[PDB]
Structure formats: structure tokens, C-alpha cells
Design a protein around this nucleic acid. Structure first.
Ligand SMILES: [Mg+2]
Ligand SMILES: [Mg+2]
Ligand SMILES: [Mg+2]
Ligand SMILES: [Mg+2]
Ligand SMILES: [Mg+2]
Ligand SMILES: [Mg+2]
Ligand SMILES: [Mg+2]
Ligand SMILES: [Mg+2]
Ligand SMILES: [Mg+2]
Ligand SMILES: [Mg+2]
Ligand SMILES: [Mg+2]
Ligand SMILES: [Mg+2]
Ligand SMILES: [Mg+2]
Ligand SMILES: [Mg+2]
Ligand SMILES: [Mg+2]
Ligand SMILES: [Mg+2]
Ligand SMILES: [Mg+2]
Ligand SMILES: [Mg+2]
Ligand SMILES: [Mg+2]
Lengths: 28, 117, 103, 54, 150, 108, 141
RNA sequence: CCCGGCGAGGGGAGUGAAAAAGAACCUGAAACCGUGUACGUACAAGCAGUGGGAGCACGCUUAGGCGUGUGACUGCGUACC
RNA sequence: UGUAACGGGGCUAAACCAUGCACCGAAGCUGCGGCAGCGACGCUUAUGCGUUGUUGGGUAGGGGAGCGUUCUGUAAGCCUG
């Protein structure tokens, strides 16, 4: 039958890049 | 009031692109690099003018010294003999005589040998 | 059969029958210029290297045509010192034809 | 495991050069039904070197 | 720009720029950086400067003869073709007819003419004294405007 | 006489893999090679090399044994887009490539 | 427009020279400028104007002083513990072609035309060759 | 009317001023991706040019020397803010 | 890490100090030919031209002059199947 082919493009409104806790330079 | 300004830019970028046609890669495809390809071309040629005169003045003395060592004389004696003979002929045409007319340049170094000797 | 001659400092050498371009000559489109301070004339092994010039001979030549020439752009630039300059330039040259050689 | 430039179509084709799929070099023919089946394979009909299998 | 002052996202963290509003004046559907208000434009020019301008415009029309003087010019019926054919056989093209006093038929005789204006005596202005090519002037209005200009 | 096929759902590399070896051949061999190549672009290109011979025998009056392929080129169709569920929050939409395949068979 | 000697028109020569008794530094620069091709009048920089030399008996070339032993030949290969060294007398007793070829490889210019000008260095170290069919001239230096 | 699965997609026919105005439709560039021609492309080292500059095809040609797409080979040179 | 404490080659001078004879060598100077600003000599201005010296690397930043695009008067004219 006939066509209708434009449905969805959503970024879902969700979170993003992560973080770190790998302690760097600290002494003395 | 609201200059919908596509028409100046689409010609201004195309001017730089058509000046930059022939450049490898994307230097002749994308405007954001194509601009810097030809500012540098102008910066190269603006020095290359006087570099052209320097390299050609380096070039002309070579065949003069070649013909001088061909006939049997140095260069610091040759130019000194021609300054004794008070000529004003430059390196371009002094080389261009030695390009073809070998017997007249032979006469020239004979004249330098007859000015010294 | 070729002559070397001075013109505005920038010298020239040519035989007969071909054109020579030079600067903006202040001699109109049909007159004739003599080069009174000619440098050299050669004719196939009957030559003389004058001190400074060949004495008697002079190369006369009719003046053929004017002309504007080549737009050659000028770009000046200093990187990140906030300065660039644009300029344009064409040369006004004039070609003549050698008509009269005189040794 | 992260690139630092965007490479060009020249390098993309230079990698894609060795993808040279060739077709079948030649087919081969029967002797009692006569079609161009593959070499060392049965026909779509069901023939192989004279026999009609099924 | 209707929305609210809430951020899109927090400032530090994810690798984008420091966004500030949904009404951001560099965004799509944002604001305008220097939008202007409903304003006026009338300047002020002096009494002396205005009358000096009138005395200046009343001179090149004399030196170029685009002003002509006629004593009587009217019609006795409210009909516009009568003025049309009167200007036709008078052989003018673009006329500024300035009357001296009130007139009703000749003022009813311009409402379809384009190069004709039935001006009153006082109500002249130094751009309609150049915008019209040719102009007449009646002797009921000469002294009525020179008592103004003095 | 030419024939087209637009919005054929495959990509513009995995359709060009079949049609770099039927450019310079005869249309007798350029059907058996497209049977005996095991891709799906073999079917997507054999159907239009069939329905170009069956449209140069009808609307041109040419023969079959006179023909020879002289040019075959592909253009790249437009794509719909749907999202793939990534994890740790993110989402990703994917571009699903479609193709315009063209056949140009001439006579002499 | 000054003349640029195109390669398909310019010729080549054939000389031989017996370098016995000649010093390296005062031989090699002349063999460098011969095949650089500048003693001919029609020399051009960017197009090759070269010659052909044949240097005969190159195991006799001597340098004065104490430098038949005190001339070193450093070269490194590419494997990290692999830079080697041979001296002048050992290179002379082993391979007396590379004592002249590297000497002209120094003084000749560097690039594709540098290797092109190196390609004509038909240099031997014997007392015969196989290009006398090309009828060469015995040059003296 | 034919190819094809009765299909989606395409070459015909009729209109239509035009249908690369065909319904995903006025005008349709650039980033990007393909075919065709000519030059260039395997001893060649680096902001990829610029100034010289040989070869080759086309374009006028009075055969000269120039128009143009290239670019043997070298002197020089380390992006923008 | 690799020669690696002349830029390399190589040099018993192609090294060192003296004397003499030349040459190359910067956009420096000279010559040709155009461009623009200030003082100036006569314009009885042409609002400068036959005169005539001299000037012209340049950030921040003070001047000086212009180009370019959408709506408005000129604009019922002009341009167009
Ligand atoms: Mg607006
Ligand atoms: Mg392009
Ligand atoms: Mg100089
Ligand atoms: Mg980085
Ligand atoms: Mg809040
Ligand atoms: Mg919006
Ligand atoms: Mg808004
Ligand atoms: Mg060891
Ligand atoms: Mg070098
Ligand atoms: Mg269909
Ligand atoms: Mg579209
Ligand atoms: Mg459309
Ligand atoms: Mg090669
Ligand atoms: Mg070149
Ligand atoms: Mg000097
Ligand atoms: Mg200076
Ligand atoms: Mg000057
Ligand atoms: Mg300045
Ligand atoms: Mg308007």
C-alpha cells in the first residue's frame, strides 16, 4: 500500500560523558 | 534593515576558490582552508619577485664563467679587462653572446687578453 | 645581423624583422626613434667591441603600438600582528619593430 | 584508539584498491542437456556429466 | 522571547559551550541584540529658517520659469472633465493650482486627476514646491502668502 | 537505451562491488556473471540489466546480439533514519543507505 | 627568455682518466663538476648537462700525511646495536670503488637529479673495461 | 502495450507552453560521492606552494609565437587566530 | 639511541697572521617607468598644472577618503516574454 516514512529522530534527553576519580599528583 | 546577506558571501568565497583552483586536496575545495592557501601564495610571490632577480643574476654568471674557462681565462681577469675596455654590457647579454656566437665571444676574450697583454 | 642597444637602462638585443617591447615610450604611434647610444652590432665575424659604443652606426626603428598589460596582484601580510595589504598593478608597455640597422 | 586528523579520499581509495572481486573465469557445458553450469557443480535442471539425478 | 530563564544544562561537565537560556540572543529563535522601540522622527526647524527656506525656493522657480501667474481660474459646475479639458486646451501637463480663498467646485475638481493639486493659499510646503513640475499662482494668493513671508 | 532503479535499499559500496566488471563486456555474458556472483547487488543489478534489454527491444527496435554495455554508473540515494539504543544513557541514530543504480546500454 | 637546454637534444661524451698519483680532494671535485656539467658553455641548472667519465685503476689514489689509516668511514644501519666502522686502508684493500663513489657523492648535489647525475659514474678500479666500444678519449687532469 | 512478484521502481504513449514542471514536484549552488577524456603517477622523503620550467593534447595559427588543462625537473619555503 | 665539540664532503693547504691585485654578495645606493600626502614656487584657482625638492616598515590607537547590499524620494518616467 501507500507509504509514510518520516517517523522519529530524538536524542532521548539523556545524560552525557562520564567523570574520573583517578587521583593525580599530590605529595609533600 | 535586515540585509539578507547571502549574495555578497557566495561571490566573495567563490572569488577565493577560483583564485585557488589547481591546489591539491581540499585547499581548492573548502573555503576555510582556501583563504589561507592564497594569502600564502601572495606572500611567496612577493618575495619571489626579488628572489627571481637574485636567482637569475646567479644564473647568468654561470655560463659566462663556463665560456671563460672554455676559452682559457678566469672571471676576475675577464671583467677587469672589460672594465678596462669600458663596456657597459650586462651579464644577460654577455651570457647570450656566449650562448650562440662563439667567435665573437672569442673576440671578446681576445680583446681582454689584448687589453691586459 | 643583430644589435644590442640601451633603452631606459634595460638593454635589448635583436636582429631585423621581429618586434621588441619596451616601456611607455613618449613617441607617438607612427614616428621613428633612433638609438643614438647603441651598444653593439654584429654581422657574422666582422664585429667590433666599441669603447664604449660603436661610433658611426645607429639603430632606427618605427614605433608600432602601445598597450596595457598584466594585472599582477600584491599581497602583504604579517602573521597575527593584525596587518594585511592589497594592491594591483598593470604595466604600460609599447612594442616597436626594428626597421633600420646601420653599422 | 583515537585518530588525530581526517584522512583523504586518496588514502581511502589506496586502502580500497585491493578489493578486486573477480567474477567466474569461465563456465562449463554439459554433454546431454547443454547448459552453462558451474565447474564441478550440478545444473539447475539436475544434470551432471550425463546423469539426470533428480 | 517566550520561555523561561532556566539553563539548558549545567555549566561545567559535558563537552559543550556555556549555554545560558532558551532566549539566547545568539541562538536560533533567540532575541535581537539591539531591537528598537516605537519611536518618532520629526525634527525641529526654526521660524526664521523655515521662512528663509521659503524665500530660497521662491527664486529658482522665477529664474527657471516653472512658476506662471494667472488671475482667474475656476469652473462653474462640480465636474472634473471641465478642468481636464481646460488644462488640455490651456496646454499644461503637471500643474499645482493654488487658489486664493476657499473654492468648492475646483476642490471637487481634483479627485481623479493625478498631476493636479488644488492647493490652498497658505498650505504650501518646500517639497511640494519642487515635486510638481509646473505651477501657477493667483493674485488672490500672491499677497496672502507675501504677508506671511514678509 | 537506459534504465534506472531509484531508492534501491543497499549502500553505495556494496552495490559498486558488482558493477566494476560488467563495464566493457557483452550482454550475453553480463547476465550469466550476474547470476553466478553470490552477492545481493548481483540481483539488484541483474534485474535492471534485464529490464533495459527488455526496453531496448521494445521502445527502440534494436536486436539482442548486437548490443554491448558501454557505461554503467551509480548514484547515491537518500536515507531514512532510526535510532539504535546505546547504553549508559546515550542513543544513536543510524543512516541506512539507499542507491540509484543506472544502466546505459548502446548499440554501435 | 634565456635558453634552457632540453634533454633530448643535448649529447654526452666518453672520457677515461688513470687517477694514479692523484689526490682525492683535488681529483673528486673535478670529477664532480664534469658530471655536474658546467665546463660546457650550455650548462643549465635544472636540466642535466652531464658527461661520462671512466676512472681507471682507482686502487692507487693516495692522500698525503698519515690518513691512509686515520680516515674513518662511519655508517649506521638501523638495528640499534649495529653501527659499524671501517678505516681507509681496509676500504682500499676491500672495495676500491666506494672510495671514489662516495667522494663524488659528497660533492655532487642531493636529490632525484642528484641520483640521476650519480647514475653516470661508471667508475672502476681495474685496468680494463667494456665501454671502449663507445670509443672514449683519454682525458688528462 | 512490454519488463517485475498483481508489486515499489524505471524506459514508452497521450496531454502539457515546458513532466531533468510528475505529485518525495518553482528556482537547485557548496561540503560529499560516482562515472569520461587528456596530461602526471613505482630510487620517491617533510604546511604540498611559488618562481623558473621540458614533455603532451586541444585551441587560434601565416608555418613563427601565443590561448588553455596539465606539470620532467630545480632555486626557495616550516598554516590561521 | 647514530658518526655528531668545522653544517657535510674532503683539505697538508682549500689553515694561521701579514701586505697587493680583483670578483660574487641585501628590498642599501644609482638609472628607467608609473602612484599618493605635506611644504613650496606662478596658477589670479579650475578649485590645481607645465614648475620644483622631499616623503611613503609598522601593533595598540587618534585622524582622512571611499566601496558594497535590503526599504524610502526621485518613480504613473526608464528596463523587460
Ligand atoms: Mg526587511
Ligand atoms: Mg571544484
Ligand atoms: Mg640585488
Ligand atoms: Mg592536540
Ligand atoms: Mg530555578
Ligand atoms: Mg524555533
Ligand atoms: Mg524571534
Ligand atoms: Mg657494538
Ligand atoms: Mg641542498
Ligand atoms: Mg514502475
Ligand atoms: Mg529533493
Ligand atoms: Mg523541483
Ligand atoms: Mg618515476
Ligand atoms: Mg614550472
Ligand atoms: Mg665588482
Ligand atoms: Mg631603502
Ligand atoms: Mg621612477
Ligand atoms: Mg603604513
Ligand atoms: Mg524604495
Amino acid at each position: 500500500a501507500a507509504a509514510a516514512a518520516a517517523a522519529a529522530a530524538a536524542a532521548a534527553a539523556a545524560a552525557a560523558a562520564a567523570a574520573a576519580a583517578a587521583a593525580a599528583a599530590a605529595a609533600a | 534593515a535586515r540585509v539578507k546577506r547571502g549574495v555578497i558571501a557566495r561571490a566573495r568565497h567563490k572569488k577565493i576558490l577560483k583564485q585557488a583552483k589547481g591546489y591539491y586536496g581540499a585547499r581548492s575545495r573548502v573555503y576555510r582552508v582556501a583563504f589561507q592557501a592564497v594569502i600564502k601564495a601572495g606572500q611567496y610571490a612577493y618575495r619571489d619577485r626579488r628572489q627571481r632577480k637574485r636567482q637569475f643574476r646567479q644564473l647568468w654568471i654561470a655560463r659566462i664563467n663556463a665560456a671563460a674557462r672554455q676559452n682559457g681565462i678566469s672571471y676576475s681577469k675577464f671583467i677587469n679587462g672589460l672594465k678596462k675596455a669600458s663596456v657597459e654590457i650586462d651579464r644577460k647579454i654577455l651570457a647570450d653572446i656566449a650562448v650562440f656566437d662563439k667567435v665573437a665571444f672569442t673576440a671578446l676574450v681576445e680583446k681582454a687578453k689584448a687589453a691586459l697583454a | 645581423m643583430y644589435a644590442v642597444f640601451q633603452s631606459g637602462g634595460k638593454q635589448h638585443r635583436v636582429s631585423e624583422g621581429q618586434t621588441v617591447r619596451l616601456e611607455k615610450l613618449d613617441i607617438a604611434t607612427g614616428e621613428t626613434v633612433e638609438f643614438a647610444e647603441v651598444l653593439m652590432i654584429a654581422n657574422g665575424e666582422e664585429v667590433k667591441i666599441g669603447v664604449p659604443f660603436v661610433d658611426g652606426g645607429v639603430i632606427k626603428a618605427e614605433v608600432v603600438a602601445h598597450g596595457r598589460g598584466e594585472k599582477v596582484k600584491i599581497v602583504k601580510f604579517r602573521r597575527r600582528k593584525h596587518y594585511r595589504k592589497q594592491q594591483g598593478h598593470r604595466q604600460w608597455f609599447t612594442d616597436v619593430k626594428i626597421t633600420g640597422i646601420s653599422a | 584508539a583515537v585518530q588525530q586528523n581526517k584522512p583523504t579520499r586518496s588514502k581511502r581509495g589506496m586502502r580500497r584498491s585491493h578489493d578486486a572481486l573477480t567474477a567466474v573465469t569461465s563456465l562449463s557445458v554439459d554433454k546431454t542437456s547443454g547448459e552453462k553450469h558451474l565447474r564441478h557443480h550440478i545444473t539447475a535442471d539436475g544434470y551432471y556429466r550425463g546423469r539426470k539425478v533428480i | 522571547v517566550t520561555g523561561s530563564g532556566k539553563k539548558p544544562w549545567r555549566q561545567k561537565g559535558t563537552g559543550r559551550a556555556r549555554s545560558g537560556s532558551i532566549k539566547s540572543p545568539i541562538w536560533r529563535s533567540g532575541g535581537v541584540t539591539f531591537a528598537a522601540r516605537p519611536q518618532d522622527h520629526s525634527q525641529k526647524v526654526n521660524k526664521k529658517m523655515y521662512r528663509g527656506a521659503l524665500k530660497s525656493i521662491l527664486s529658482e522657480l522665477v529664474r527657471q520659469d516653472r512658476l506662471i501667474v494667472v488671475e482667474k481660474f475656476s469652473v462653474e459646475a462640480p465636474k472634473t472633465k471641465l478642468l481636464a479639458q481646460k488644462l488640455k486646451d490651456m496646454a499644461l501637463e503637471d500643474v499645482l493650482i493654488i487658489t486664493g480663498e476657499l473654492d468648492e467646485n475646483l476642490f471637487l475638481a481634483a479627485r481623479n486627476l493625478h498631476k493636479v493639486d488644488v492647493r490652498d493659499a497658505t498650505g504650501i510646503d518646500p517639497v511640494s514646491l519642487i515635486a510638481f513640475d509646473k505651477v501657477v499662482m493667483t493674485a488672490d494668493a500672491v499677497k496672502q502668502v507675501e504677508e506671511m513671508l514678509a | 537505451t537506459i534504465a534506472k532503479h531509484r531508492h534501491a535499499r543497499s549502500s553505495a559500496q556494496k552495490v559498486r562491488l558488482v558493477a566494476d566488471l560488467i563495464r566493457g563486456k557483452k550482454v550475453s555474458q553480463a547476465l550469466d556473471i550476474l547470476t553466478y556472483t553470490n552477492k545481493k547487488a548481483a540481483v539488484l543489478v541483474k534485474k535492471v540489466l534485464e529490464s533495459a534489454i527488455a526496453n531496448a527491444e521494445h521502445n527502440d527496435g534494436a536486436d539482442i546480439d548486437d548490443l554491448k554495455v558501454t557505461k554503467i554508473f551509480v548514484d547515491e540515494g537518500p536515507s531514512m533514519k532510526r535510532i539504535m539504543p546505546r547504553a549508559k544513557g546515550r542513543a544513536d541514530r543510524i543512516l541506512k543507505r539507499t542507491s540509484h543504480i543506472t544502466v546505459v546500454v548502446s548499440d554501435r | 627568455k634565456t635558453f634552457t637546454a632540453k634533454p633530448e637534444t643535448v649529447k654526452r661524451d666518453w672520457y677515461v682518466v688513470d687517477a694514479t698519483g692523484k689526490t682525492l680532494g683535488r681529483l673528486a671535485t673535478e670529477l664532480a663538476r664534469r658530471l655536474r656539467g658546467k665546463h660546457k658553455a650550455e650548462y643549465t641548472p635544472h636540466v642535466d648537462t652531464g658527461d661520462y667519465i671512466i676512472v681507471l685503476n682507482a686502487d692507487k689514489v693516495a692522500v698525503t700525511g698519515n690518513k691512509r689509516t686515520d680516515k674513518v668511514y662511519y655508517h649506521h644501519t638501523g638495528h640499534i646495536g649495529g653501527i659499524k666502522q671501517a678505516t681507509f686502508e681496509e676500504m682500499i684493500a676491500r672495495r676500491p670503488e666506494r672510495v671514489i663513489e662516495i667522494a663524488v657523492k659528497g660533492m655532487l648535489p642531493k636529490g632525484p637529479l642528484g641520483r640521476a647525475m650519480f647514475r653516470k659514474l661508471k667508475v672502476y678500479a681495474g685496468n680494463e673495461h667494456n665501454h671502449a666500444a663507445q670509443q672514449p678519449q683519454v682525458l688528462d687532469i
